[PDB]
Amino acid sequence: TTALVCDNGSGLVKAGFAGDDAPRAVFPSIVGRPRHQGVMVGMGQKDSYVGDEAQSKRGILTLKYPIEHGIITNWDDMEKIWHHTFYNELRVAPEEHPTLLTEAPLNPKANREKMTQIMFETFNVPAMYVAIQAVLSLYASGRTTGIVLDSGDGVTHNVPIYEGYALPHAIMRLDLAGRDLTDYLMKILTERGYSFVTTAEREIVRDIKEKLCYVALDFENEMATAASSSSLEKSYELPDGQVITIGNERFRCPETLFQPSFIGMESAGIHETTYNSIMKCDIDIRKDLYANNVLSGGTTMYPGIADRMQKEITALAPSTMKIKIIAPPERKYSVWIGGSILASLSTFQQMWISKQEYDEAGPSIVHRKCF
Amino acid sequence: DDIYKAAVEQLTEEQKNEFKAAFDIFVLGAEDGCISTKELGKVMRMLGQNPTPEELQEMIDEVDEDGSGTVDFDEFLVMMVRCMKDDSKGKSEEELSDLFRMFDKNADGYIDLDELKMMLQATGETITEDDIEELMKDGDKNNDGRIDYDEFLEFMKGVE
């Protein structure tokens, strides 16, 4: 039979059968209970709208993501999300399909063990396998080397790989991602008068960020230009009218990636954690990693980031090496495409964690040889 | 590919007139007289199926060799039947590889065209020397004078 390549993510759940080009169903991972009282009788009001249904009734819900930073903080809601994904968005019972979840690097063990225990006890799948979210993104590019920066919505991690041999001592995981950029944008919009507070209006700020923000090639020059002319002010129509005008908030929101001091984080930007991740590698594979830097994940879709990052790394790196940044147009679904490719391989067909194996060793089987 | 050309050659005027009437009904009001890549993709998205525009470009390059993005009658039927890709998996790989390896009766690593000639005499399909020459050209990519094993995979790739 065919395998189910699910990809929990944090912000958008992407799923679909193995062997295709794009995920079959992509929908936000939010579960929102209603918060008001409700007076109409017999309206058929449910107790929790999940997935894309709660992005249409969000006016009277309190949306809450079940995955904070890679890790899962609310297991009941995550179980509800998985149940919805299997039964309503794909309509395939899990009793007859292997599953291939994905997990960020350096995550707590208990999260992974609980994930496999749920998949084997509640949904009762035949066999499931958990894979690191960066190796898949490297599969999708058709490479076999390269250092991949997978800046998702929950957590940004940077896994270097050479000739198929991952370097476990050079993984640099940073917890700044799309959600913190949304919060920072929502916080700097208040400097013009627009106040978004409700958890429903966070979605509106996210839409503003997606449609308007861009990464500046040079920060100081853009700050000077936006403060003199008015060629940058782009307007946007809220879900009820009252258009708003975003000035130099456009390139200040995604600039937080390269200067995490804006949101008070100490660490260095995504332009310098990649160079540090390279320098921890051996001295003889640094040229190949320099030449095959891969971008993935949703947050790396800002217009103009593949040039800013290349300029920064070229500034840091030695002058002789060639710096090349691979930015495929299908960046958002790169991890899932790689997952489909991996699940479609014949050599991989014996790596699944078969159910009888789980019955013999318990949920701690995932840390064992079947990784 | 020419697989769909063979499939539509199997088909008759029934399919021709059926798809002609379907064009008359649905493409009614289009200023084209054919189906464009963009039109086909937009219509697919309207119905629900969402193939990639790269697939649109691939299909238009295949059926419409001139690159016009339209569909001539024969290539139109080829493109229309291309959507339903029922036959896949290309027969068997290793067993057919053994058959091709034993096809080299001389066992020199070289497949003489005369062995192919004898096998075709066994088949006896209506073919002239230019036809088998053209087929070998489709197969003998490197023009090494034989049927290369990798090229044997290539020409039988996807072939049922």
């Binding site: 062997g19 | 009437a21 649905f26 119905l47 199926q49 969402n50 959507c83 339903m84």
Partner: peptide
């Protein structure tokens, strides 16, 4: 590395979905 496509769903179903209600003979 081979590529598998399930996007190419049955073409008769595509014709039915496009023609909607008028999808009677095709």
């Amino acid at each position: 590395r081979p590529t598998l496509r399930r996007v190419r769903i049955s073409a008769d179903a595509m014709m039915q979905a496009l023609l909607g209600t008028r999808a009677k003979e095709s």
